[PDB]
Ligand binder design. Structure first.
Ligand SMILES: O=P(O)(O)O[C@H]1O[C@H](CO)[C@@H](O)[C@H]1O
Ligand SMILES: O=P(O)(O)O[C@H]1O[C@H](CO)[C@@H](O)[C@H]1O
Ligand SMILES: O=c1cc[nH]c(=O)[nH]1
Ligand SMILES: O=c1cc[nH]c(=O)[nH]1
Ligand SMILES: [Ca+2]
Lengths: 327, 327
């Protein structure tokens, strides 16, 4: 059920309990781990290991412990890494038992108790945007999420009650897009994470009088896919006539969600966020996501890679580290 | 929709058309690429590049061109790599168009025509088995496939007609397991691939009298998951109470499919094979899978990693190379 090495490491993420911080940045690309850890406090990296697509490094930022982990691509990879983080934080290997939480029936009244709210997890990724308004290389910050994948369906996502706002998102997506064919699920980033990210963006821009060092951002719904091409409505060769949702981008882009705190739109599409939000919330860990827009699927109809991306990612790394330690 | 750089490479797989063989081995673990390429003919490796979890090397095996590609984990990763292989093989950059196939309405009478059956793609992976009879470190060779993931739902898998045998598998899975809650799909490895793999196993075993060097194998149905833990029925900490299919292993292990070529059982569980089979068949490419059983989920209830795995994987690499060039 949960393979643990003789060295106390989990199976994919080769990290031991005492090497993992409560505050974690997820990146998809293993290459981004070294870029991020370079921003950690000088000589603070105390643990690091690489295996498959899964790399980590743990240091400090402004004195607060932080771990950066590459997950590789997809919600399936997320499911792996979050299960292993769960075991590293809450399975006491020394005693061979799961840690108590407040409210456990047969726990001693003294505990000790593990507080899941101490876990803060933020994805810093890349993404596409179906929104005409959203600029190239903007930071798209997740509030709600649409799971077009099915990973969380194995964790009762199809039956567990959701908020009124999430019910409205699901209704609109099911009625007004080709996802009518899919048992989609929803989730939401923890409000504390979304707020922290936005505040960090604001602080960044306020701290520079150079227009070139500004970072644009947007907040909205992130749609997460179980692939990159047809799974995101890309039309490729001999596959295109077989697509279930060939007009995914335009369909998602047309949506407006009339939600409790105002109107929300689908700001971005990527491959991890839905499961990060859902599985983290299920565990009581605070999670969210922010992704640099590298593909404009409308308007510009371009990709934005290379130097421009590198510069945007440098700004966003600092913003996310700031948000993470202030959460 | 299909980004191809000026260097002629696709976005994730960093291979040029002229560097990719018609015969391909897929591995999940990027580490396995170097292990496999070491079995290529001496001084034959002519192209290689790494990016994210996606590594390749192209050489020859007994004179036939072969490429090994790591996909990383999951059907989402497969969707990426197969789309990119499709473009590299069938998008003609010099013509600015997709290659003609026989049957195309407005193709020139003489073509030329790309023959998709020239593509031979075999996954060599690791897996779990829910089958009591399947020995540890056996090679589980895919005939039929169950997609417990949803990647191929984006390619009409939920509505496209399937064979009588696949209809029966779906019926039995829905009848007798908690997967009735999921719009599961099915596929099948190409018969030529299944047969070639089995023949290579038989040839390996006939060539040695050393019992310690025999490779046991089974042929059957591979169930593919959108994760590793709850998505494969593993029970982990605070997730366990929220599983949709907590008895997945016992339920899958109990199934018998009374199919046209005889009785078939679920031999193995892993993360890539359903989409490999489904998407390749959709393209007309010949594909299949063979995975070393590293997790016995019933009976033994153990993992089989380390030197024992290394020895089995060495045998199986040679077997799959033999199968691949004979296909
Ligand atoms: O750049 P990363 O963080 O991987 O994120 C995005 O890029 C990958 C696909 O190219 C997917 O992982 C997607 O979510
Ligand atoms: O060993 P590889 O080829 O990655 O295959 C298996 O191992 C991974 C999970 O550990 C998944 O990719 C699964 O399909
Ligand atoms: O369109 C995009 C761009 C980056 N990552 C994605 O998953 N999709
Ligand atoms: O049980 C297992 C073992 C390896 N790979 C899997 O996907 N599952
Ligand atoms: Ca994946």
């Amino acid at each position: 059920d949960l393979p643990i090495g003789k060295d106390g490491t989990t199976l994919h993420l080769k990290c031991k309990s005492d090497e993992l911080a409560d505050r974690i940045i997820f990146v998809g690309d293993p290459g981004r781990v070294d870029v991020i850890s370079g921003y950690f406090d000088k000589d603070s990296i105390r643990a690091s290991r690489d295996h498959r697509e899964i790399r980590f490094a743990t240091g400090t930022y402004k004195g607060t412990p932080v771990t950066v982990i590459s997950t590789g691509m997809g919600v399936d990879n997320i499911e792996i890494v979050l299960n292993e983080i769960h075991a590293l934080k809450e399975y006491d290997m020394e005693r061979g038992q799961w840690r108590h939480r407040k409210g456990d029936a047969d726990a001693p009244s003294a505990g000790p108790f593990f507080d899941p709210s101490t876990m803060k997890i933020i994805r810093l990724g890349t993404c596409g945007s179906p929104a005409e308004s959203v600029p190239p290389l903007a930071l798209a910050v997740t509030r709600h999420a649409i799971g077009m994948d099915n990973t969380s369906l194995y964790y009762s996502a199809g039956t567990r009650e959701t908020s009124k706002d999430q019910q409205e998102i699901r209704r609109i997506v099911r009625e007004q897009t080709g996802l009518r064919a899919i048992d989609i699920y929803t989730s939401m980033a923890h409000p504390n994470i979304t707020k922290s990210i936005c505040a960090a963006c604001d602080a960044h821009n306020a701290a520079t009088g150079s227009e070139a060092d500004k970072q644009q951002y947007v907040i909205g719904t992130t749609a997460t896919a179980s692939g990159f091409y047809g799974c995101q409505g890309r039309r490729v060769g001999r596959f295109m006539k077989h697509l279930t949702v060939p007009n995914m981008v335009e369909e998602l882009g047309s949506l407006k969600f009339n939600l409790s705190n105002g109107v929300e739109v689908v700001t971005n599409i990527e491959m991890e966020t839905s499961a990060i939000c859902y599985l983290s919330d299920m565990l009581g860990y605070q999670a969210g996501a922010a992704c640099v827009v590298v593909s404009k699927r409308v308007g510009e109809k371009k990709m934005f890679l290379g130097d421009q991306l590198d510069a945007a990612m440098k700004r966003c790394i600092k913003i996310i580290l700031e948000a993470l330690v202030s959460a």
